[PDB]
Design a protein around this ligand. Structure first.
Ligand SMILES: CCCCCCCCCCCC[N+](C)(C)[O-]
Ligand SMILES: CCCCCCCCCCCC[N+](C)(C)[O-]
Ligand SMILES: CCCCCCCCCCCC[N+](C)(C)[O-]
Ligand SMILES: CCCCCCCCCCCC[N+](C)(C)[O-]
Ligand SMILES: CCCCCCCCCCCC[N+](C)(C)[O-]
Ligand SMILES: CCCCCCCCCCCC[N+](C)(C)[O-]
Ligand SMILES: CCCCCCCCCCCC[N+](C)(C)[O-]
Ligand SMILES: CCCCCCCCCCCC[N+](C)(C)[O-]
Ligand SMILES: CCCCCCCCCCCC[N+](C)(C)[O-]
Ligand SMILES: CCCCCCCCCCCC[N+](C)(C)[O-]
Ligand SMILES: CCCCCCCCCCCC[N+](C)(C)[O-]
Ligand SMILES: CCCCCCCCCCCC[N+](C)(C)[O-]
Ligand SMILES: CCCCCCCCCCCC[N+](C)(C)[O-]
Ligand SMILES: CCCCCCCCCCCC[N+](C)(C)[O-]
Ligand SMILES: CCCCCCCCCCCC[N+](C)(C)[O-]
Ligand SMILES: CCCCCCCCCCCC[N+](C)(C)[O-]
Ligand SMILES: CCCCCCCCCCCC[N+](C)(C)[O-]
Ligand SMILES: CCCCCCCCCCCC[N+](C)(C)[O-]
Ligand SMILES: CCCCCCCCCCCC[N+](C)(C)[O-]
Ligand SMILES: CCCCCCCCCCCC[N+](C)(C)[O-]
Ligand SMILES: CCCCCCCCCCCC[N+](C)(C)[O-]
Ligand SMILES: CCCCCCCCCCCC[N+](C)(C)[O-]
Ligand SMILES: CCCCCCCCCCCC[N+](C)(C)[O-]
Ligand SMILES: CCCCCCCCCCCC[N+](C)(C)[O-]
Ligand SMILES: CCCCCCCCCCCC[N+](C)(C)[O-]
Ligand SMILES: CCCCCCCCCCCC[N+](C)(C)[O-]
Ligand SMILES: CCCCCCCCCCCC[N+](C)(C)[O-]
Ligand SMILES: CCCCCCCCCCCC[N+](C)(C)[O-]
Length: 80
């Protein structure tokens, strides 16, 4: 179906963007800068340690999901 082909191309494009070797680094810097809203030195440092540890964990989950564009698109009722 057209909505299915479109949905699967969009999820593919998302997955390719996330596979890009500079994407995770860009996100990491952005989230570490956010931690700088916290007092220093200790709270901001603890926040950066949680980001550094968990961002690649969360990224991996998303990328895994984008690797199955049919499944994603079925969950949205766009592929059947
Ligand atoms: C995850 C990206 C989704 C892009 C696919 C676009 C959704 C197609 C819209 C289908 C529903 C339109 N409607 C209401 C007339 O059925
Ligand atoms: C009337 C405009 C012609 C095409 C309109 C529908 C195209 C939806 C955009 C597809 C998404 C592009 N993509 C997959 C590279 O991200
Ligand atoms: C119902 C309209 C279908 C459009 C689905 C949404 C497409 C995601 C847009 C990403 C931008 C990609 N691009 C090349 C079209 O710019
Ligand atoms: C489920 C689809 C959610 C993604 C929506 C975001 C679309 C990003 C494309 C932005 C492009 C806009 N513009 C004017 C710069 O072309
Ligand atoms: C579950 C997927 C929803 C994410 C929708 C956002 C589309 C990201 C694709 C961006 C591709 C870059 N591009 C073609 C606009 O230059
Ligand atoms: C949401 C799943 C992961 C993909 C996130 C999609 C949003 C990014 C689309 C913005 C396009 C990026 N760019 C190069 C124009 O800055
Ligand atoms: C379902 C998760 C997708 C949500 C993230 C989509 C956000 C796309 C934002 C791109 C904005 C592009 N620009 C240059 C016009 O700002
Ligand atoms: C769903 C997890 C968060 C997705 C947010 C990713 C947005 C990245 C901004 C565009 C940068 C990607 N790239 C390839 C141009 O470097
Ligand atoms: C997995 C958590 C995702 C939410 C984080 C949003 C990512 C923002 C990355 C955009 C980087 C901004 N910029 C333009 C300086 O590249
Ligand atoms: C738990 C998911 C991550 C939530 C991320 C919230 C970040 C939004 C705050 C904007 C940060 C902007 N800046 C320029 C300081 O990097
Ligand atoms: C650990 C992943 C989440 C990254 C975002 C960090 C949250 C700190 C933002 C709270 C802002 C602090 N304050 C006092 C300026 O509001
Ligand atoms: C899980 C926590 C994610 C939320 C992080 C966003 C914090 C928003 C507070 C922004 C306030 C920053 N400032 C400098 C304007 O005070
Ligand atoms: C876990 C979901 C929470 C993610 C959303 C948190 C974003 C907070 C952004 C507030 C930014 C405030 N300000 C004015 C500095 O931009
Ligand atoms: C050393 C600074 C003293 C308190 C620092 C920790 C407070 C965290 C901020 C709580 C969130 C505020 N709230 C719940 C209204 O959003
Ligand atoms: C580990 C540090 C604990 C901070 C948790 C994040 C608090 C969310 C910030 C929302 C902004 C609320 N307020 C009043 C503090 O600005
Ligand atoms: C949903 C908002 C969450 C705000 C709560 C802040 C998280 C507290 C950090 C506990 C973990 C610190 N650590 C790694 C030293 O255990
Ligand atoms: C302001 C820093 C809090 C980051 C927001 C994301 C939710 C907090 C999760 C912290 C997890 C800590 N731990 C080790 C108990 O998993
Ligand atoms: C920027 C990402 C923010 C950190 C997200 C923290 C996730 C902690 C999940 C703890 C769940 C432990 N579990 C699954 C055994 O219950
Ligand atoms: C929009 C991002 C949603 C990510 C949802 C995935 C759940 C996080 C998995 C928990 C982390 C695993 N663990 C137990 C090692 O902490
Ligand atoms: C703030 C990013 C979202 C991550 C939070 C996800 C909650 C993880 C704890 C429940 C996971 C249970 N289980 C068995 C599916 O791993
Ligand atoms: C593209 C923006 C975020 C959407 C992708 C997030 C994946 C959702 C995965 C939740 C269930 C996955 N799991 C743990 C059962 O494998
Ligand atoms: C759970 C999905 C997280 C939402 C992702 C937010 C993407 C913000 C797009 C910022 C990139 C736009 N630009 C051109 C300034 O880089
Ligand atoms: C905006 C995109 C919507 C994301 C929808 C995520 C669908 C999750 C499918 C759950 C299937 C579980 N598993 C482990 C087989 O992937
Ligand atoms: C784009 C926003 C995220 C909404 C996508 C959630 C997927 C819904 C389809 C699976 C739901 C299954 N169930 C039984 C829990 O309803
Ligand atoms: C933008 C947030 C989208 C996240 C929604 C995730 C949908 C998961 C569908 C429920 C199915 C449960 N499970 C474990 C089979 O994945
Ligand atoms: C701004 C919100 C975007 C629309 C989100 C669309 C969610 C559709 C979920 C369909 C799932 C139907 N279901 C659960 C029976 O499979
Ligand atoms: C970050 C937002 C995550 C929302 C996840 C909740 C799943 C969406 C529920 C599906 C909508 C129900 N239904 C079948 C009436 O479409
Ligand atoms: C560009 C419009 C698409 C919105 C992005 C959110 C996912 C599409 C879900 C459309 C759901 C349509 N329907 C009626 C089949 O549920």
């Amino acid at each position: 179906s057209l909505p299915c082909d479109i949905c699967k191309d969009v999820v593919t494009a998302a997955g390719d963007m996330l596979k890009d070797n500079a994407t995770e680094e860009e996100i990491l810097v952005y989230l570490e800068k956010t931690c700088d809203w916290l007092p220093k030195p200790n709270m901001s440092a603890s926040c950066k340690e949680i980001v550094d540890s968990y961002l690649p964990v969360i990224l991996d989950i998303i990328k895994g999901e984008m690797s199955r564009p049919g499944e994603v698109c079925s969950a949205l009722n766009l592929c059947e």
